Amino acid sequence: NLIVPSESSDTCSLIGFIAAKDDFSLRLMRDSPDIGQSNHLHGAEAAYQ
Amino acid sequence: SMMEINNTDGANGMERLRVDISVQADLDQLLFNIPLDIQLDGPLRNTLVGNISRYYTHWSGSLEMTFMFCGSFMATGKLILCYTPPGGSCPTTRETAML
Amino acid sequence: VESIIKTATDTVKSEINAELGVVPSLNAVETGATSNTEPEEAIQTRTVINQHGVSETLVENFLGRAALVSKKSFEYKNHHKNFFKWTINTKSFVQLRRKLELFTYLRFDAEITILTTVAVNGLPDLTLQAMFVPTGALTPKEQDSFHWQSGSNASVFFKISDPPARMTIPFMCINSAYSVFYDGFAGFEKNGLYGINPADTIGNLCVRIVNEHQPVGFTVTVRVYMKPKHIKAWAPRPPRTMPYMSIANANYKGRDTAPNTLNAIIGNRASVTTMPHNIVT
Amino acid sequence: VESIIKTATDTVKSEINAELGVVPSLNAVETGATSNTEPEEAIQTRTVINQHGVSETLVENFLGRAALVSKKSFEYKNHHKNFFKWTINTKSFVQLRRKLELFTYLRFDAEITILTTVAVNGLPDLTLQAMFVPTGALTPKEQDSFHWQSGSNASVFFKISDPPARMTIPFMCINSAYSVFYDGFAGFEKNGLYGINPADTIGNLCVRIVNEHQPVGFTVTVRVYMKPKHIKAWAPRPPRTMPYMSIANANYKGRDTAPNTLNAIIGNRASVTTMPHNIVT
Amino acid sequence: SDRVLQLKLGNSAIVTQEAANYCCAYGEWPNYLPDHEAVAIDKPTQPETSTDRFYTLRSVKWESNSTGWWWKLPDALNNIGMFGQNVQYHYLYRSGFLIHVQCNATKFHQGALLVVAIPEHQRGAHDTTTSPGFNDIMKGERGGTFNHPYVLDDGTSIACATIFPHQWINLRTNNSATIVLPWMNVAPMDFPLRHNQWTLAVIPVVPLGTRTMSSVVPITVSIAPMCCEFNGLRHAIT
Amino acid sequence: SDRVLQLKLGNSAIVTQEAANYCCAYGEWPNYLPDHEAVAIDKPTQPETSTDRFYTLRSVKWESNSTGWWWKLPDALNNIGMFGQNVQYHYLYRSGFLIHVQCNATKFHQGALLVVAIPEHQRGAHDTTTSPGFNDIMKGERGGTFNHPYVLDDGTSIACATIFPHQWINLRTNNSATIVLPWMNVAPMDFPLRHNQWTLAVIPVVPLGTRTMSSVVPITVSIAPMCCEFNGLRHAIT
Amino acid sequence: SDRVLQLKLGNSAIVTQEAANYCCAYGEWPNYLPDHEAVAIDKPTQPETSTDRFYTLRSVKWESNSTGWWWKLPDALNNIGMFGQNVQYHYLYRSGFLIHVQCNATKFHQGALLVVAIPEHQRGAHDTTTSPGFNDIMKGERGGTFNHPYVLDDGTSIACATIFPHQWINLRTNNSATIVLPWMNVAPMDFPLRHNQWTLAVIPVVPLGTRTMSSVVPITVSIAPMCCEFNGLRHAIT
Amino acid sequence: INFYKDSYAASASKQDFSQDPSKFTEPVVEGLKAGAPVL
Amino acid sequence: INFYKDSYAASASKQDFSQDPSKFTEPVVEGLKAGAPVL
Ligand SMILES: CCCCCCCCCC(=O)O
Ligand SMILES: CCCCCCCCCC(=O)O
User: Fold this and answer.
1) Which CATH number is F1-238 given?
2) In the list C37, F18, G193, I9, which could disulfide-bond F175, CB 3.0-4.6 Å?
3) Which residues make beta-bridge pairs with D11?
4) Which CATH number fits domain D1-281: 2.60.120.20, 3.40.250.10, 2.70.50.60, 1.10.10.60?
């Protein structure tokens, strides 16, 4: 159990991290689903003016 | 890099990057679980390994999760972190996860 | 520390451990170093001769792809009057932009491919001219101005019926590498543009249809692709999460609702003990 | 047991046999072994130096042919709205399917050839884009969506006037070989699809006409051919006899009347003593 | 000499005095996973005698109108003994199989059974476009029955099924069939609950017949896993 | 240096940053049964990683008036994981045990637990001539509680219990106790369901006390069988 | 051993008794510009001790709702001491930096600060297409504050910020962070008044908390330029 | 000659004349002698 | 083979397999030993 004295906060935080080890390998490149656009970005068209 | 484990309604910004644990009144309590989804959105998606891996389709290799306790020096405790290979439903009791 | 890596590392079998003073699974994140705990120290492992290759993740391959950097449609008819000018930049299309922005500095030569398509408002096999106008040089004002004589500027003439035009632009920065990000101002006064390194200024790509107009009008679309090669990259960075807003800065707003909202990058789940795609048997 | 075979085996002359305890023509099918009776032991033979080659039956040649795997027609006009998406599979056309199904496992690289044809509802020399969208990647929703910028996906741009486009897809299974047949389910729950190994999931082939629509409509047909090479094959199987019913399974019904009816694969003859194409002199 | 045979594994043994040699699928023999083909990095458990032994399934009756029987592996054994326990507690498994099919009658009976081990026997359904469901495929220890043995319930043919590892039980000649199966898969190990490497099929090509006293003539199947290895330990998916 | 420790067996590992060295019962270490001491002639199964790993039992709460707790081995694990399965399917078993008792509090708490491994701890009943019954002895994973810890519930004394392999958890000093137990019996192997080689006893000789905020202070037990061997395979006595 | 540290440069020194080793950005160390990488041909001035020393900036208060702080280099020091004078009188400068962030509390406090050195940290503005202005970027010695630390005020993420040279100050563990930064730029030297090579960011990922007496908990930054070189002498742009 | 950098891009490989029919025709543990009674 | 006179015109260079992850994973001045307490 988490056990603390009266003057220590009774709710504590954990920060979790993750990483690959050196036995890792990736294949078959594809476009990432994490970014996209439905319109011209501001200033894109102005590059032609 | 940091996993967004507290991806819940009510948690805003950086609050989503830390998991709060409290002094328990009962024993063997479940504190949290982490979906190991990389393709589907989840705590592992916005990490260095998650972001880069998503530019690919196939993967192989071991992963490592490190947790840093950020309570005060006077706080003590023991936790058990479990990885359950696939096949069944996510364990909800320590007696099962511990296997 | 540096070494040649062609395959993923092998695993060595490990035995039971019960040693005082030895705790490989404990670490100190505060040092800034990533955990050095090996699988062999966390659990009992078997021996595995790993033959998995790592070449598809070489930076040269990761960035070595022709990506769309410019797309422009204009009307070809009797009058953009049969030509256009594009101030070169690699920030208009998000797929390429996000990948380049995974690095702080980049040094590379750039293969440029130009694809042209036409539609009637049969199809004429037009001749086009793409002229590279470097910084400080004069840009054309008309489809027929003297500028197109291109006495020194490099120009490429190609037909719509030929394969896409292609040429390589060398690494041309005045520095040893391009600054993908620039925490500074482009001028000596205080009103200059922020985040734009003058050193990475390429110039303008001027494209015109060489043929005089026909009796009818056509819509011509020019697409430019860029593929970096002979790449060197430095200092990787956090990937972009918020949608891009402008080609001139890193301004952000976030999606209206998760995922990728300013308030929450990852979509919500009911609670920290809720497993989203739980297997139900 | 393994050896290099370049020609059919020779025959050696044989003499009269009358040996007690020796009966080469008798066998025991129950052991599961095929008869080992040699021609020389069944009859008196002469010597024959056989020079007949066996290379045309090499697996590499048997399967090494470009076969149609996809055919799709769509309307190119002002609005499948000028593009389509095809979830890749090798089970839609029966000639290729039956041959691949003569084996249990197959490992090979695949040469892909794309042939395009057009018809008016003269012919325009259009530019098309075929983008390979791997599993988990987003597929285009419109002829002009951002997805086509293809920053990482492999895309090939080709014209109808050029020879068919061609490229090789490597053996890309997550296993050591593709599972032509799979006696299992694709998921951890019980409602998954049967007979479909997830490991052999390639992805989607997205094809669009790059040109904006013309004033009139056209019918465009795209045919995709696949030719396996650098082939390795394991465990041959009984050939398909019943007509195929679905691309998702081996379901069967049989023809309405012989041949190849569920009740009778071979067509009937009047009786077991009736010779069908008997020579009448 | 090749008519008598004794098979011994773990605490189990079987003898036959009417065998027909025995088949080693594709001329191979079972073996443990070598380091140069391994993928899963956790140290595997190799229980040996507790799992590598003969498990006898419930018998079936050979009737005048029988169409044939089938048992899928490892499904048929996934809930039997320690092999079953290891399968339930581990995400991954690997093993070969020693199959022994038994069937005796009298010198007045006739009949012939094709005993074939089919790799990846993906079943098809009859006269419908709907794919077979979970319960049509996973029969467990009881095994299943052929609907249309003539086409092996997959639209092909039993006539050419001899291309697969097999033996025959021709009553007049022998009373048992034995087939040794090595690990057969495109991966070094697999999840045992959703994929069956082999399917044992026993089909009466020549029906059982006689004019002597009628008696129930059973067909019995005994299967011994070989060189079992398990990885990915966790709780049981019992 | 002797305050930090990591124990790793199978797919399990445990670390402590407040240990007090660790005890090896009678200076021994677990080992497999050698041929010159063997009795049962059947080839044993040695499952290794599937059974030789840490199993954590349900925790207990250390209260101001607690008398102590006990868990008998192998009974406490006879129904847990693959160790439990092997125990149920085999007449004979043999193994050592790595015990790790855990209990943390604050620098403001005081208390001392005697953590002792007692061989053949034959319990006695209080104030009656009737011997303890099956249910008084076999508590399984839940373990039991001491009625009169002062005499170890057997008419002797806890004062002299230090003659047995042990450690202490003195809150002010450490937060865990570790004891390695070798096979302890007069026979090379035994029937696991009717005899317990060891009894783990955890007794608060100095009660838990503090003047700071009250919190539930648990005591947790993790046990890893070592060098497991099983003989006499049959059906499960589940 | 790696918890105590003393840094000495010029007439300045700093000691910490609760360090966590220290970070050398990208495994490099500062150095003077070699002849084979030089561009500017005038003989440079290398003031050494007058500029390569620790400069302590004004402290900031760590509050329960703080979002984080940042200081850009060399801007933060462009008007401090002799480093500032050389910067104002010379068109070009070059140097590394030794950063030491300080923050102590009690053993009853909790909190965690990410201390990261970001190269070319180009800021973005929130919810507008207008680029950040001069005064939004050049804060000088006072430094700035994060508006949306969650995305590092640049549309990316703090979660992945660990890809940059960094350390953490976790109150329960240490009270200081130390990072050595080498010259980081695409040019051998640069104009110090319009470009910042590095940005020091200090962000409370885990908020400051306690139940003991409240006290102001400051965070202090000390920075020492290293191997300073200046070229292009003229009048001061003071 | 393959001018591409990836070997899988090469033309077909029609030179593997190795065979072992016996894995399909005689998968019996005990080799069957020519004229000797198989049983 | 590059037939152009300028080397920057050549095809891609996909042969640099050198790596040094430690500049990102272990940029600490004092090397951290395997199982020895980091602090
Ligand atoms: C199409 C011509 C491209 C020339 C090279 C441009 C490099 C831009 C690097 C960047 O700042 O992201
Ligand atoms: C057109 C792309 C083909 C990729 C390779 C597909 C292999 C399928 C093998 C099969 O299951 O029959």
Assistant:
1) 2.60.120.20
2) F18
3) D48
4) 2.60.120.20
